[PDB]
Design a protein around this ligand. Structure first.
Ligand SMILES: CN1c2ccccc2C(C#N)(C(=O)NCCC(=O)O)c2ccccc21
Lengths: 219, 220
């Protein structure tokens, strides 16, 4: 089986930028008829994927002159000479020279902007959930940049790696930042077995984690 | 005008069966190769199967045996019989028209969503997320809303019926355990709340659910 490897999984760019996205095949991808069936697709948010390039270098009719494909052997490249706002989305490479046909993981074309430390907010269980016998400790790390971030929970001083559900938003269309939610889900009794609940955020901006917490009995 | 419209997608219990359909237009199946490609929740693209202008059929070993592609050349309808369905088979399915020995997936349909799950329609638990006394000592304040354990997706969450639009972040739903859980956060000035009313409005069409939760300051 021929596997396609894409890099990077996220390419932050400034509009006007000339960019190059790469794709690596586990081995040579030349069909027995001599053609290389390497295709490039762009999927715009909310839409289905669209063809850009076929057979390595052929630009699909109707596709802007700023897109172009190249490569040989196991190395392939998609080029965009001058990035526009419309080009933002995820690009996928694909090989159909050998079966099974294989897709690359995709590379997200995202926008660059100034670094942004996240605003961290921690929320103790609501009395209604408690009343229903549940206890969810939510934490929001909002509007940060770059998207890379680590969240750590500490219950009564000790780290809690188990039972954490995290979700991330796509880059904001207005401020180009990113946000994430982390929810520690416990039981009413489990939650009442401790007093301190802490949410720590490690962003390339703070190093020493942004720390937020509360005590089940005081504030 | 080439057109591809997928139908049949829907909820299906594991091991269950489902037939997807794709009505084509603007071309003939005798002149083009057709395929099915799916996009998983993770946004990963996967080739499901294809049938050439001449009838030849191809499948990856993962789909081989479980899925069956066929076509009605006369009515110009492509089909995908799905069986032995697992949660990993949960994805958006697209039929695609390609050019023989030229381009595999030249034109994609918008797709039909297939969701494999044992879960049953469950209304969501909507909880108001008020700040801890420590976070409320600034010029702005972040409030939240927890929409827990619902099925299926989606739910519709707004703030003040949509009145409250900016400074909001409604996070993608995740599976808590065959059930979905989502949360939204809204950030406003300290003078906006609790000084002014802020309610989380969550609807869940599948269960005819429409609940409202007002975020009240904590404390006795
Ligand atoms: C679209 N298309 C396609 C679609 C469905 C099924 C097969 C193909 C195909 C392959 N292999 C192709 O053109 N097959 C012709 C049948 C044959 O091998 O003689 C092929 C080869 C290269 C590029 C595209 C395609």
């Amino acid at each position: 089986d021929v596997l396609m490897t894409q890099t990077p999984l996220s390419l932050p760019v400034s509009l006007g930028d000339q960019v190059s996205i790469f794709c690596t095949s586990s081995q040579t991808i030349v069909h027995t008829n001599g053609n290389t069936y390497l295709e490039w697709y762009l999927q715009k948010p909310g839409q289905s994927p669209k063809l850009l390039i076929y057979k390595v270098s052929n630009r699909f009719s109707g596709v802007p002159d700023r897109f172009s494909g190249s490569g040989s052997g196991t190395d392939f490249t998609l080029k965009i000479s001058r990035v526009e706002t419309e080009d933002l989305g995820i690009y996928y490479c694909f090989q159909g020279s050998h079966f099974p046909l294989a897709f690359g993981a995709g590379t997200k074309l995202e926008l660059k902007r100034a670094d942004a430390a996240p605003t961290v907010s921690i929320f103790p269980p609501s009395s209604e959930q408690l009343t229903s016998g549940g206890a969810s400790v939510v934490c929001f790390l909002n509007n940060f940049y770059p998207k890379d971030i680590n969240v750590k929970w500490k219950i009564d001083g000790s780290e809690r790696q188990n039972g954490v559900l995290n979700s991330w938003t796509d880059q904001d269309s207005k401020d180009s930042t990113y946000s994430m939610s982390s929810t520690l889900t416990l039981t009413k009794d489990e939650y009442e077995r401790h007093n301190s609940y802490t949410c720590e955020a490690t962003h390339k901006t703070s190093t020493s984690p942004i720390v937020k917490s509360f005590n089940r009995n005081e504030c | 005008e080439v057109k591809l419209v997928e139908s049949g997608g829907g909820l299906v219990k594991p091991g269950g069966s489902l037939k997807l359909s794709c009505a084509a237009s603007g071309f003939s199946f005798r002149n083009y190769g057709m395929s099915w490609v799916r996009q998983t929740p993770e946004k990963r693209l996967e080739w499901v199967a294809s049938i050439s202008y001449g009838g030849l059929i191809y499948y990856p070993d993962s789909i081989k045996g479980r899925f069956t592609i066929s076509r009605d050349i006369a009515q110009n309808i492509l089909y995908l019989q799905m069986s032995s369905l697992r949660s990993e088979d949960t994805a958006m399915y697209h039929c695609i028209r390609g050019d023989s020995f030229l381009v595999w997936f030249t034109f994609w349909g918008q797709g039909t969503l297939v969701t494999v799950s044992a879960a049953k329609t469950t209304a969501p638990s909507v909880y108001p997320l008020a700040p801890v006394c420590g976070d409320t000592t600034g010029s702005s304040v972040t409030l939240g809303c927890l929409v827990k354990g619902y099925f299926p997706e989606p739910v519709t969450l707004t703030w003040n019926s949509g009145s409250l639009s900016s400074g909001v972040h409604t996070f993608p739903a995740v599976l808590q355990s065959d059930l979905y859980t989502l949360s939204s956060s809204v950030t406003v000035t300290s003078s906006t709340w609790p000084s002014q009313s802020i309610t989380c409005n969550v609807a869940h069409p599948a269960s005819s659910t429409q609940v409202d939760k007002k975020i009240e300051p904590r404390g006795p």
